[PDB]
Amino acid sequence: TELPGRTNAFRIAEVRPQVNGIILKRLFKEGSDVKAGQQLYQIDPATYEADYQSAQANLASTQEQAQRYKLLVADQAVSKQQYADANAAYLQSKAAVEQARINLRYTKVLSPISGRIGRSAVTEGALVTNGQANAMATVQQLDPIYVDVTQPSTALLRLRRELASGQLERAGDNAAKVSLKLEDGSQYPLEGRLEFSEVSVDEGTGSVTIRAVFPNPNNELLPGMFVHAQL
Amino acid sequence: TELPGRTNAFRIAEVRPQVNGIILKRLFKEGSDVKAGQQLYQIDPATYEADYQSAQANLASTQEQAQRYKLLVADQAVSKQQYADANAAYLQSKAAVEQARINLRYTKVLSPISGRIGRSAVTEGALVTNGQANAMATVQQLDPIYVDVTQPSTALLRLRRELASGQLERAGDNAAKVSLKLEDGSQYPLEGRLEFSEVSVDEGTGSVTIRAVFPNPNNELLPGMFVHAQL
Amino acid sequence: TELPGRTNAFRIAEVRPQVNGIILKRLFKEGSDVKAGQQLYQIDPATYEADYQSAQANLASTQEQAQRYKLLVADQAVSKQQYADANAAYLQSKAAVEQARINLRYTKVLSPISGRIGRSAVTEGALVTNGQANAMATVQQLDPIYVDVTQPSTALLRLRRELASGQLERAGDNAAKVSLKLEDGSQYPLEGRLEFSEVSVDEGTGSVTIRAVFPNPNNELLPGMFVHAQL
Amino acid sequence: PATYEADYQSAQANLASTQEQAQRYKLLVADQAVSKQQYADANAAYLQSKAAVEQARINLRYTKVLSPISGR
Ligand SMILES: O=C[C@H](O)CO
Ligand SMILES: O=C[C@H](O)CO
Ligand SMILES: O=C[C@H](O)CO
Hints:
Chains A, B, C: It is found in: Cell inner membrane. The first copy, chain A, is of the alpha+beta class.
């Protein structure tokens, strides 16, 4: 039985800035392969770095001030109102520092997912804003790759039985082994699982949509291909 | 007697953001079974978390300030026009904190219902906005599953009698036991209740719509199937 | 004398939101019986509740400020302008609080009438807007139930006489006792009034439409049934 | 032609505007001051205007229905 379907990325992510600034450098090759956590951009941190240290300097100061006044109050050598204020400043500083630290950190735009980055919608030297509508770039995990198959609700059950009645070659719980046949006609060398758990149902058609998962190193398979799963 | 009908989810909910931000992680398998209250997404909280603590710091401060002026007014050491401004700030802080707390909490996009989530209409790293038109995802309770049956108003009464005149196998108050027959032809193994209380009436047809309730573990039954209840 | 007619709800009401937000919970069973004033939905109030208290805090503050300046102005200790601005703020806050309170109240979507709610056109987690076109649900009082009867203007007088000339069994002022006969053929066990005051007239036909009122506990009778009143 | 003439000038006013807008961005994109996305939008409008004006001009011209052939 041949099931028609479309190939889709296994996982997709968007790269976006979360701090305001100028793109200093774009550390990745358009179209290359990147790893989740890998620095993809560098926003000029000259300032954030400066504010962050400017801050810590402050905290170090107010903190000393506080820790000391608390000693004085204990001898009644300073009104508790003086202390309260001292500790007040200390807490604000401590807050400032944390926010500074957070912003500096957001300075190195990292990749959320592991996959294939494409073109960089943002040029070096460009101005980038936190919250900005457009994404700097998009990564896609193309290795294990999906094949969305759509069968009428009935057939999905028919197959589900055969899977349980051993009439279908097991591949795992709720999964039967399957082969792929490109619209080319050719036979994709490798083979993969065909999970039976439903992903979506067009109630207007009643038809269900399940996913097949094929290994795709070499990146032979790409999203959008009209293929055929085989059982 | 065989009553035609369609299978429908037992309950449906939508997943939506209620805070602005970037989708950090999508904690769920498209097509899986999720529980109500289960975290479905994580919106980056670096800041909301910072603000929230920045606030609490403040409240901790003003609160002390206030409480002290409260005891001080008695000795007339602190006026009443002070303990007023003081208590003013205290109340504002307390409010800021609650608002901070609320936003942080929305940072974890939980699932409203227990059911089956399908595809995630939002990619990781994407930008999400409170009030946004589109829903991030949709959960559907499919275990007990409904079967909407439509009979002409007359028939509904005829059956209602037999139910009371013992001529129909009781299943509970106003419910008669029923079996399901898929459009496949097969006989759904389990059987369930056919509640007689009306759910809706197409006055333009006069016909009524009642619901059958079948157990559906194993998830064999899906919404949209054209079935037949049997009595 | 058998008068043909259609059964109709005794009263209809629509459930709609009057505040913006997300449907947290839908507290009612589709197809059940609900009482006027009963909470049907809960719109996530996390924020409205927060704004309301955020407001009250503010009012508490400005109000003190005002009452104090009202003092200083009366002692030429401060200009009338200062007292003016202070009172200005006070008045704004007081307005803010009232609006907050109103919105919070709308957070609980109560049922306007007592009757029978059907399906909920809105899912939990859904986005709901004040002013939105569609109604979240519809309650229909079905106990006393109407039976719209249509007779030629002439016949309505004929009967009206007999009613006054004792030739018809009184049921109340302008009402004659009547029995119902379902299109089933059967005899509805209970009986009710047949009010003679006209409700509408198809001037294009000259025919009048009057209503019969039958008790309908057990909910045996439903809107849309083609029946027959008997005199 | 009262209107065609009005639309035509209504248009030309527009183009004169958007054209200035564009020519100005044309330089800020070179000095990475304006996002290549924006300059795109500016030049987009400019091209639309220029298109509108041509159509306006064409219609105004037709305000004078001429004879295709020489004859009777
Ligand atoms: O983001 C992937 C491609 O480069 C563009 O659209
Ligand atoms: O929402 C259900 C499916 O995942 C999509 O369309
Ligand atoms: O709203 C009345 C019925 O429940 C549905 O359509």
